[PDB]
């Protein structure tokens, strides 16, 4: 029979128990059966994501059939699965694969809706089955659409259904958008709990349920592409095979074996010795550990065999529930279940006595090992406060203020509908502002390019919200997306700088007030993106004249209050009061200058190590660089070009002169106004 | 034989009764028959949005051919349908689409002027690779083909106005949208087919209610299709609920659990309890079988009723004399009256249950995939569920809403036309939010427009819509996208006095027409929305003179102030300007209390049991309070002075979830305690 050729009977496999027990989704299966026994629009299709038990939904429906958990109209029916390449196994000619296909269709005509086939990827079966002088399955079964011999079910993704299915009329009006939702954490955990024992059978191990829920936690937190229960399945099973590899280890065996073969080499050469006795000791130790290893292996072997016996007893008592034997039910239950459970736990505690070199219970630590091969609040707090001091030098008031703000952010007991970051950073330029943004990215967002640099200096013009945000087109920044909102649509996990807020406009504050209240923000294109996973930072220079002037012999709090009054002169106070905290960046006077110039000197030393050079700087040269490099208006930028000129021009001037020898202490002695390198 | 490979004999299907007895549309069918008996240009096209059943129109034409209602050029023809996607999808190389296409034409000429063709997706046939229209050009032109189109008006103006042979080798037949009552009669014709298929009965008031709610709570799908889907999915849901049961499952798990318990115990009492539960389960089971047998008899007699109707239609075609009167006068009334006896019998016996699908099932299917008027009777109570004070404005807005959904005034004029004054911060925007919320859906499912900004001509060009060939074009005005994506919302106009007076002209076109022409040539209606204009012109006039001064005369005073400000034409078209007086200190304190309510809600979201001194609440209400701005400085000041020291103490490792946390006062501030 052609049904016997290349079809996969799911009811037969579930009757043989070969399919895995699918848990939950009863609303989905119920609404699926709602779509099933309709008069028109009679073929469902599972719109979802690649990997989400959509196949398992079909097989769980077949399991409800074998269980008889279905309505009477679905009783007696047949759930089969048709493979493509099985039909394309031995047929390439002019109409033989298609002859097989039409014979399968004639068997569908033989059953008359008794067989309810499943074939996923309808769009693939429509728009990829290319054949030469021959047809596809799509246009040969498109008759079975309007012939009623096809109550088949589908499965696809949200996009390809819309590509290759919604465009056709008949392929519309035979088919139903059976959407499937993203499942939860805990339902996935429950499916894992149901299918834990199958994996413990296959992989000879035991599974910790705290490790199950923590695996679900870190999978939902970290793993992007994989889905449910796909990443949970893969983490569990990959950790199971990992522990299986650890079963097929040890390591001190290899230590002692290399030792005994090395001393065997030595004693074979020496044929004084003492090494006969040393070899005898190490061989006895190796034999003892070897016999211990074999004993542990025998213990786990008996334990896993009796575990598989327990699961086979569960299978047999389910067969007794389907068939209905009388003494078999109570016999299998009351005899086999508690005695095998208690001696399985007796073997478990026997192992937990003797598991010296080995483990079988996959812990959460094992899951973390897999994931690292693939906690939060206080650790993030303390290491954040530490990492503030490294790149950005000084600004300890701002260190503590931004530490408080991040603390009150990650507390989440403020307004959660506000975005994470709301910051005005006052001070002159140079001063680590961009460096502070990158350090905040470096630890909160744990990377460099989690930021979007946009100044508001370009946005004095009336068309700020248009080019910035998204507009009615005719512009440039539309097919790009935009400057800001559509780059957050690119980067939803980022940090926003807004330099030069003194260069503002009424369509700057208002968009920012919608940010401050909402996070979600109206673009031109009509698709708001939330900002409550991101940090918004502003900077200005308005009272920074006073910051350059009177940071010396004045405090921080009253200076912050006076410059907040200055911002209240400049801005509307209703704008500046939805910010978390407005802080002050002082002019970096001496040691910050020495440190950052020393950083540039050390990376210069690093690149000349790559050349092969060894250079030391004089501190008087450092003093002249501190004088020549810092200005009261700009800071690091004249320091950069002063380092550039007064170092690298005589330096490369003399290196290319062939004057300097690699391997000498190249001391950077001072000239009158320059720096001289010497060879000693 | 590509006809076997690509076409569908619909005449075979309706000849075997597979198809819908399609109802109505007779004028358009007749104009199609007019087109199909021409000498040249023998091809109608069907212009209408998909889901209006143009397919079904051709189907009903085919059923009329089965009836033989046609003139003398169509008797004996065979109507066959065809896709283009069945032809395009096999194009590996050059010349493989087109061998199929010419072999189609060879079969068409082979049947020698006897086959009427159907092709939908005409705009698809435009593009396949020249490709498709040019091979069909001679048979479309020389009368040797009788193609029938089916497409949409947008695709007509996009594709079919390009190739002129694609134009005049077809002909327009306009396809309209079916009405409310005609949908009802259609579903009456479709009722018996559904009741045969899903083995159940249908409430016909639930059918007309399904039609009402299909027009009401559905925007995309249309008729016949959306009501088809509603009735089909509801009938399937009821058929699943009948074809199950739940109490039987509870009793079965109970008896097998007590059976295992009694098997373990072998004091007893459990033989007796098990026998009682088995007896109850057997009673429920026998009731279930009696119900299923009753519905089986009802479905069999219903199917015999339909077979009698098909037989009397075959008698109308063939012409048997006594068979007509016999089948009608005997078989129709007695089977209908004992079908109604089965109806009242299953109304009696379905308990655990119903088969007649009610409109609540329609509500399930609809909201998954009715107290509106009476909520509008208590709409003032709804508005004062959330916003305290300003009772008169609530009353007037409820008056406007009752006039709106009662429909007394001009329906071409918009719903809400309200200028608002007085000082802000008291909850005008909060009133807007709750108004859109309990009125239609949600708080911020609206449109806010910052009319403080717009002061010049280019500003008008912004919010109205830039003219084509200029800067701000392809997504309309600021307003136009905001309303065209939001068919039922509320327009907000803040700081109307800051605008240049030319935008008031746009407002007047709103208030008269309701359709508003943008720069993009399309009118976006406002008639199903509410315009709210707001300002603050007579703020201090009310603040100085709210004390023991009435609503009406102070309204008239500030109305005279607006007359000093605004246009007489503009204040002519106003429905009503409400006062929006400053309420009181205790009511703004109560609004702060509600902010504390949502605050404590968020603390309970964190999971803290936190209480407060009422003196602490008074200090809060006296922190940021100002008459000049309203409660919003009070809102942000209380929010800061709570969220900073409290979460400071929480991150200080002091507060424990599950302790007595009374927000006691400081000398000027508030401390939390741990008890």
């Amino acid at each position: 029979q052609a049904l016997k050729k290349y079809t996969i009977d799911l009811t037969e496999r579930a009757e043989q128990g070969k399919l895995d027990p699918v848990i939950g989704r009863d609303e989905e299966i119920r609404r699926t059966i709602q779509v099933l026994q309709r008069r028109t629009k009679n073929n469902p299709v599972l719109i979802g994501e690649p990997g989400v038990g959509k196949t398992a939904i079909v097989e769980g429906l077949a399991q409800r059939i074998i269980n008889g958990e279905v309505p009477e109209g679905l009783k007696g029916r047949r759930v089969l699965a048709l493979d493509m390449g099985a039909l394309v196994a031995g047929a390439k000619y002019r109409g033989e694969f298609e002859e097989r296909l039409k014979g399968v269709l004639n068997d569908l005509a033989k059953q008359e809706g008794n067989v309810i086939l499943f074939i996923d990827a309808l769009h693939t079966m429509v728009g990829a089955g290319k054949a030469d002088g021959a047809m596809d399955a799509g246009n040969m079964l498109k008759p079975a659409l309007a012939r009623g011999e096809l109550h088949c079910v589908g499965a696809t993704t949200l996009d390809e259904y819309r590509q290759y299915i919604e465009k056709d009329a008949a392929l519309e009006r035979r088919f139903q958008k059976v959407f499937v939702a993203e499942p939860s954490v805990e339902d996935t955990i429950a499916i894992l709990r149901g299918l834990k024992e199958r994996y413990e059978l296959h992989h000879h191990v035991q599974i910790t349920d705290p490790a199950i829920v923590a695996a679900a936690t870190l999978s939902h937190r970290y793993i992007a592409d994989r889905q449910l229960p796909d990443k949970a399945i893969d983490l569990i099973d990959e950790a199971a095979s990992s522990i299986r590899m650890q079963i097929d280890s040890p390591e001190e065996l290899d230590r002692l074996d290399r030792r005994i073969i090395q001393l065997k080499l030595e004693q074979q050469a020496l044929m004084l010795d003492m090494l006969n006795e040393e070899l005898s000791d190490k061989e006895r130790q190796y034999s003892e550990l070897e016999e211990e290893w074999k004993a542990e292996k025998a213990s786990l072997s008996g334990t896993q065999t009796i575990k598989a016996e327990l699961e086979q007893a569960k299978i047999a008592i389910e067969q007794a529930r389907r068939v209905g034997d009388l003494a078999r039910m109570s016999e299998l239950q009351y005899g086999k279940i508690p005695e095998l459970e208690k001696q399985l736990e007796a073997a478990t505690q026997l192992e937990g006595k003797t598991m010296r070199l080995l483990r079988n219970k996959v812990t959460d630590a094992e899951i973390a090992e897999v994931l690292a091969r693939w906690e939060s609040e206080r650790e993030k707090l303390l290491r954040m406060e530490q990492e503030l001091h490294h790149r950005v030098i000084g600004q300890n008031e701002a260190v503590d203020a931004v530490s408080n703000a991040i603390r009150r952010s990650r507390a989440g007991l403020a307004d959660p509908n506000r975005p994470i970051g709301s910051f005005l950073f006052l001070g002159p330029t140079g001063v680590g502002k961009t460096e502070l943004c990158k350090a905040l990215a470096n630890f909160m967002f744990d990377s460099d390019e989690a930021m979007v640099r946009i100044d508001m200096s370009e946005f004095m013009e009336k068309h700020s919200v248009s080019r910035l945000v998204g507009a009615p087109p005719g512009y440039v920044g539309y097919e790009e997306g935009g400057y800001l909102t559509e780059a957050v649509r690119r980067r939803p996990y980022s940090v926003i700088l807004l330099d030069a807020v003194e260069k503002a406009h009424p369509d700057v504050f208002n968009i920012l007030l919608q940010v401050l209240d909402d996070g979600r923000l109206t673009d031109g294109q009509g698709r708001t993106v939330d900002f409550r996973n991101t940090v918004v930072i502003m900077t200005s220079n308005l009272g920074s004249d006073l910051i350059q002037e009177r940071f010396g012999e004045l405090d921080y709090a009253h200076m912050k209050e006076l410059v907040l009054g200055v911002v209240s002169h400049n801005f509307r106070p209703e704008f500046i009061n939805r910010i978390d905290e407005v802080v002050v960046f002082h002019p970096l006077g001496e040691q910050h200058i020495a440190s950052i110039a020393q950083i540039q000197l050390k990376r210069l030393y690093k690149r000349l190590e790559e050349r092969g050079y060894e250079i030391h700087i004089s501190d008087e040269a450092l003093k002249l660089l501190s004088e020549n490099g810092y200005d009261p208006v700009y800071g690091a930028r004249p320091l950069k070009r002063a380092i550039q000129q007064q170092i690298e021009n005589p330096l490369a001037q003399q290196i290319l002169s062939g004057e300097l020898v690699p391997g000498k202490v190249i001391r950077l002695e001072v000239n009158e106004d320059r720096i001289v390198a010497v060879q000693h | 034989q590509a006809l076997k490979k690509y076409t569908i004999d619909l005449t075979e299907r309706a000849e075997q009764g597979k198809l819908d007895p399609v109802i109505g549309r007779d004028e358009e069918i007749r104009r199609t028959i007019q087109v199909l008996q021409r000498r040249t240009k023998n091809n109608p096209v069907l212009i209408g949005e998909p889901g209006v059943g143009k397919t079904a129109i051709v189907e009903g034409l085919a059923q009329r051919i089965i009836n033989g209602e046609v003139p003398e050029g169509l008797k004996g023809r065979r109507v066959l349908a065809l896709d283009m996607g069945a032809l395009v999808a096999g194009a590996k190389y050059r010349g493989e689409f087109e061998e199929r296409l010419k072999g189609v034409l060879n079969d068409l000429a082979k049947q020698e002027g006897n086959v009427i063709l159907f092709i939908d997706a005409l705009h698809t046939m435009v593009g396949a690779g020249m490709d498709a229209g040019n091979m069909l050009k001679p048979a479309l032109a020389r009368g040797e083909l009788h193609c029938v189109g089916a497409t949409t008006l947008d695709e007509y103006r996009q594709y079919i106005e390009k190739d002129a042979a694609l134009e005049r080798r077809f002909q327009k037949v306009f396809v309209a949208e079916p009405s409310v009552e005609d949908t009802i009669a259609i579903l009456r014709g479709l009722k018996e087919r559904y009741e045969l298929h899903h083995h159940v009965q249908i409430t016909d008031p639930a059918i007309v209610a399904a039609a009402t709610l299909s027009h009401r709570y559905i925007a995309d799908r249309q008729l016949p299709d959306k009501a088809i889907d509603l009735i089909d999915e509801a009938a399937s849901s009821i058929r699943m609920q009948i074809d199950s049961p739940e109490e039987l499952d509870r009793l079965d798990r109970r008896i097998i659990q007590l059976k295992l318990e009694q098997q373990a115990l072998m004091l007893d009492m459990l033989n007796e309890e098990l026998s009682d539960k088995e007896r109850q389960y057997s009673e429920l089971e026998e009731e279930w079988k009696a119900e299923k047998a009753s519905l089986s008899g009802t479905q069999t007699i219903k199917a015999e009723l339909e077979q009698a109707k098909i037989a009397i239609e075959q008698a109308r075609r063939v012409g048997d004399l006594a068979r007509m009167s016999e089948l009608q006068y005997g078989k129709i009334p007695e089977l209908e009256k004992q079908l109604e006896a089965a109806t009242q019998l299953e109304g009696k016996t379905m308990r655990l249950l119903r088969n007649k699908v009610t409109d609540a099932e329609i509500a399930e299917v609809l909201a998954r995939w009715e107290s509106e008027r009476e909520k509008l009777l208590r709409m003032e109570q709804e508005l004062h569920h959330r916003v305290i004070g300003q009772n008169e404005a609530v009353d007037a807005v409820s008056n406007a809403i009752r006039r709106s959904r009662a429909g007394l005034a001009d329906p071409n004029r918009p719903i809400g036309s309200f200028l608002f004054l007085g000082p802000t911060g008291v909850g005008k925007t909060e009133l807007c939010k709750a108004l859109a919320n309990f009125m239609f859906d949600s708080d911020e499912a609206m449109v806010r427009i910052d009319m403080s900004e717009f002061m010049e001509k280019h500003s008008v060009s912004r919010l109205v819509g830039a003219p084509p060939g200029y800067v701000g074009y392809e997504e309309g005005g600021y307003l136009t996208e905001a309303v065209r994506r939001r068919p039922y919302s509320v327009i907000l106009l803040d700081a109307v006095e800051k605008a240049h007076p030319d935008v008031f002209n746009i407002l007047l076109q709103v208030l008269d027409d309701g359709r508003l022409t943008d720069g993009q040539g399309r009118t976006v209606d406002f008639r199903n929305t509410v315009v709210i204009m707001t300002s603050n012109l007579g703020s201090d006039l009310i603040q100085e003179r709210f004390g023991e001064l009435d609503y009406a005369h102070m309204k008239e005073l500030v109305l005279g102030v607006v007359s000093h400000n605004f246009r007489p034409e503009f204040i002519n078209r106003i429905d009503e300007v409400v006062v929006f007086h400053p309420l009181g200190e205790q009511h703004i304190a109560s609004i702060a209390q509600i902010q504390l309510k949502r605050l404590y809600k968020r603390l309970e979201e964190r999971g803290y049991e936190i209480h407060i001194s009422d003196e602490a609440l008074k200090l809060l209400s006296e922190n940021g309070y100002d008459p000049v701005y309203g409660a919003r400085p009070l809102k942000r000041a209380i929010q800061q002075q709570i969220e900073n020291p409290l979460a400071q103490q929480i991150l200080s490792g002091e507060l424990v979830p599950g302790k007595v946390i009374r927000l006691e006062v400081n000398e000027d501030r508030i401390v939390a305690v741990q008890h």
């Binding site: 087109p473 005719g474 | 194009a91 190389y93 050059r94 690779g129 200029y470 800067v471 392809e474």
Partner: peptide, 24 residues
């Protein structure tokens, strides 16, 4: 036995457009 016959292999490419504003 037969031979692997040569094909025809029709291919296609596309175009963008460009729309241009005015300043005033």
């Amino acid at each position: 036995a037969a031979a692997a016959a040569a094909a025809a292999a029709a291919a296609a490419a596309a175009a963008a457009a460009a729309a241009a504003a005015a300043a005033a």
